[PDB]
């Protein structure tokens, strides 16, 4: 099975680091970060990297669609056109392919999920964040992510999460909602779904560095005052985000097909 994950957010929020942390990949070996003068009028480009992931015993084709340039320019007016056009184009190709006679070999390139990285440095969502999510929330499953969560104390983290949730509701933004746990599922799975839901939006830390979490070399970030552990759920939500994505990949695909694609398809009629 193929899964396509789009990544959007201001440059410098640790997005490439988190993405590589999720799957132990190296998707950006030749990435060049432009200088400030080059970013004044930078345009958004689409870059797609496809890798084979064999988590547990299941192998899957993961495509990460990055949007370098998003938010870089002084005037970010058309910072959405190229992204929106890419999402709709994949819907367009699928519609042509499923209506044709070669339905047997359809490559599904529809975007199944969008990680939107929110800066932890402000007080809440910024006008650019709100406008982009409102521009795509009827087309893709939005998963909002608080970047660089190790910049926030616990109280600051609770305050920012609560405000982001309030603003999503205030602006009528539709983000992806996890399916409710069925009654036939055992207790420790229902509590698992509840714990994941309670931590949205996930506040995550990523790292490509091995540090000393006294007793063992683990993923983290070293400061003069201590060490943040990527996989410590008491430090950040990386494991919840990872578990959420792996557990709900199939549901994310099905919502893309049953909701966003069908709404594109009916809205398509001239």
């Amino acid at each position: 099975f193929e899964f396509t994950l789009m990544v959007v957010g201001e440059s410098g929020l640790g997005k490439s680091t988190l993405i590589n942390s999720l799957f132990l990949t190296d998707l950006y070996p030749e990435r060049v970060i432009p200088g400030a003068a080059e970013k004044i009028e930078r345009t958004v480009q689409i870059e797609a990297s496809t890798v084979e992931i064999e988590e547990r015993g299941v192998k899957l084709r993961l495509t990460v669609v990055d949007t370098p340039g998003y938010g870089d320019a002084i005037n970010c007016r058309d910072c959405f056109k190229t992204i929106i056009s890419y999402i709709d184009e994949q819907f367009e190709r699928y519609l042509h392919d499923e209506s044709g006679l070669n339905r047997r070999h359809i490559i599904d390139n529809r975007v199944h999920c969008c990680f939107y990285f929110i800066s932890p440095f402000g007080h809440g969502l910024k006008p650019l964040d709100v406008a982009f999510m409102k521009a795509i929330h009827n087309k893709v499953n939005i998963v909002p992510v608080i970047a660089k969560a190790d910049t926030l104390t616990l109280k600051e983290r609770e305050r920012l999460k609560k405000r982001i949730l309030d603003e999503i509701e205030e602006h009528n933004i539709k983000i992806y909602h996890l399916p409710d746990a069925e009654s036939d599922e055992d207790e420790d799975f229902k509590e698992q779904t509840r714990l994941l839901k309670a931590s949205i939006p996930f506040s995550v830390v990523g790292s490509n560095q091995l540090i000393e979490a006294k007793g063992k070399k683990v993923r983290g970030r070293l400061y003069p005052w201590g060490v943040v552990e990527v996989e410590n759920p008491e430090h950040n939500d990386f494991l919840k985000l990872r578990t959420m994505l792996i557990t709900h990949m199939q549901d994310l695909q099905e919502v893309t097909q049953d909701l966003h694609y069908e709404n594109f398809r009916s809205e398509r009629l001239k």
Binding site: G12, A36, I74, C76, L125
Partner: protein, 247 residues
């Protein structure tokens, strides 16, 4: 006596917190929303004692900087304020019966430019704004919320920032520690040893504001407030104001 500090920085980047920490008090620090239609400025004046010296301190903060989708001309309201204080001083000099000794100087003597800790270099808005300000005010670039940057990232990030300032010809204030200052602010206290210290408490450790191995706050407070206050005023008068006065 009189000292006017301009804080330029994105919404929530820590301007009010850093000023409270720098002067060890609580100024007016009402947060802005992210929905301001454009950049405006908030000015507040305070009477403080900074050692022995009667200090009439004015703090001018940007409001809404970096928040709009279209960030064109974000520098203009800042330059307008700076130029207005230049013009007020010039009008004082052109009075017939005048008393420049009595005059409360409102010109910005120091601009703290808060750089968001991306870990890359400068944002386009940072470059454009600092270039528009560098002949009008003593720019002191600082890395805000510097506890964001790991030990193994700070030196490279500082060097990338300076390289951008040099290659783009941004004139920054030269004081008569590796620059730019990487600062942490906090009005909260944590017990460190047997004393209560301004600090930020994380599940994994405590960032101490006055620990020079944690951040450059002590060096900023030393250079800006304890040492070079008179030089910043004089450079304002003899260089930046003189450029305005020449036309």
């Amino acid at each position: 006596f009189c000292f006017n500090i301009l804080c330029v920085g994105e919404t929530g980047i820590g301007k009010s917190t850093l000023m409270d920490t720098l002067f060890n008090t609580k100024f007016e620090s009402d947060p802005a929303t992210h929905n301001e239609p454009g950049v405006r400025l908030k000015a507040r004046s305070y009477e403080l004692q900074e050692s022995n010296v009667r200090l009439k301190l004015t703090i001018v903060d940007t409001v809404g900087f970096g928040d709009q989708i279209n960030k064109d001309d974000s520098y203009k309201p800042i330059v307008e304020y700076i130029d207005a204080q230049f013009e007020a001083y010039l009008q004082e000099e052109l009075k017939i019966k005048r008393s420049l000794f009595n005059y409360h100087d409102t010109r910005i003597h120091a601009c703290l430019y808060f750089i968001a800790p991306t870990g890359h270099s400068l944002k386009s808005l940072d470059l454009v704004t600092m270039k528009k300000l560098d002949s009008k005010v003593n720019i002191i670039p600082i890395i805000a919320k510097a506890d964001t940057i790991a030990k193994n990232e700070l030196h490279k990030f500082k060097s990338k920032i300076m390289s951008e300032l040099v290659s783009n010809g941004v004139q920054i204030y030269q004081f008569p520690v590796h620059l730019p200052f990487a600062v942490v602010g906090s009005t909260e206290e944590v017990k460190i040893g047997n004393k209560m210290a301004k600090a930020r408490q994380y599940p994994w450790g405590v960032v101490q504001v006055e620990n020079e191995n944690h951040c450059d706050f002590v060096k900023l407070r030393e250079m800006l407030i304890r040492v070079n206050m008179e030089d910043l005023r004089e450079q304002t008068h003899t260089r930046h104001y003189e450029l305005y006065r020449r036309c």
